[PDB]
Design a protein around this ligand. Structure first.
Ligand SMILES: COc1ccc(F)cc1-c1ccnc2[nH]c(C3=CCN([C@H]4CC[C@H](CC(=O)O)CC4)CC3)cc12
Length: 281
């Protein structure tokens, strides 16, 4: 740790604080997260190297603290969306970012690694048009964030403890809808409000669309029964290729939900390109 100099605080989580830091004996600018089974599960993340995954450079265990050293990126997608809120991110750039994240997930998922907590703030962007997955899934000062449950898959909210890679596809579908509309798809402020916001839009799930849903640990037969609203209302003015892909990413049944690998073949990406975003750093 004596090999690093703090420059500023760049973030916070339930169990850690993140700083922008400088490596004294290499000159590298990194992001440093300060926090036996964990030491091994995080050492496996060091081998999960892909152009669309923020590089985990090192793991340092020093005097009852764990430090994670990552490659530094200047902006996150949440800030870029907040900065593009009045104009909207151009469709070619939304498509490029979605494609790149599906490539990163196809990679993680093939190595049996789930992210579990995809949200705009852990999607980092650079000046080259790249987007990368960060912070693969207590400090008393951590401030509760409005967006915390907004991207949670319904199986997680329904108490499934052995959920699959499909939970990441759900979170990315929510992010895709948000880039298009400039508003959060399911802005829930509690587990039940999050569940009911999903139900209000996609219809209350039942055994027809999600076999086994009524046997989930937190499923209650007393949940109000909302009709599925027609999908053209959910992400206007996104085209039919985009709406079709999004509907597949938001299927209730995790087994019907499109995989990252199949999503890359979707006709929506036939004209995918890699535009350069305009970033003000
Ligand atoms: C999500 O990423 C992580 C999570 C855990 C972790 F351990 C490391 C990383 C991580 C890895 C690599 N590179 C990174 N870069 C960054 C940020 C760079 C600048 N962001 C800005 C500051 C200014 C704000 C506006 C204002 O406050 O005025 C608008 C947002 C914050 C986040 C975080 C981060």
């Amino acid at each position: 740790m004596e090999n690093f100099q703090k420059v500023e605080k760049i973030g916070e989580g339930t169990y850690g604080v993140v700083y922008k830091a400088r490596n004294k004996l290499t000159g590298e600018v990194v992001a440093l997260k300060k926090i036996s089974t964990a030491i091994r599960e995080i050492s496996l993340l060091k081998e999960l190297n892909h152009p669309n995954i923020v590089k985990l450079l090192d793991v340092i265990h020093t005097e009852n603290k764990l430090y994670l050293v990552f490659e530094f990126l200047h902006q996150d997608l949440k800030k870029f969306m907040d900065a593009s809120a009045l104009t909207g991110i151009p469709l070619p750039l939304i498509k490029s970012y979605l494609f790149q994240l599906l490539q990163g997930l196809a990679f993680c998922h093939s190595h049996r690694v789930l992210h579990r907590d995809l949200k705009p703030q852990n999607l980092l962007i650079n000046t080259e048009g790249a987007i990368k997955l960060a912070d693969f899934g207590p400090v008393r000062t951590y401030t509760h964030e409005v967006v915390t449950l907004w991207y949670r898959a319904p199986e997680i909210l329904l108490g499934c403890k052995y959920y699959s890679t499909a939970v990441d596809i759900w979170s990315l579908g929510c992010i895709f809808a948000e880039m298009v509309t400039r508003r959060a798809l399911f802005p829930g402020d509690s587990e039940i409000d999050q569940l009911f916001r999903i139900f209000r839009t996609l219809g209350t799930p039942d055994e027809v669309v999600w076999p086994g849903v009524t046997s989930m640990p937190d499923y209650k037969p007393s949940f109000p029964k909302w009709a599925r609203q027609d999908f053209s209302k959910v992400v206007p003015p996104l085209d039919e290729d985009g709406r079709s892909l999004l509907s597949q990413m938001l299927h209730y049944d995790p087994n019907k939900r499109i995989s990252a690998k199949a999503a890359l073949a979707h006709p929506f990406f036939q004209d995918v390109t890699k535009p350069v975003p305009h970033l003000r750093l």
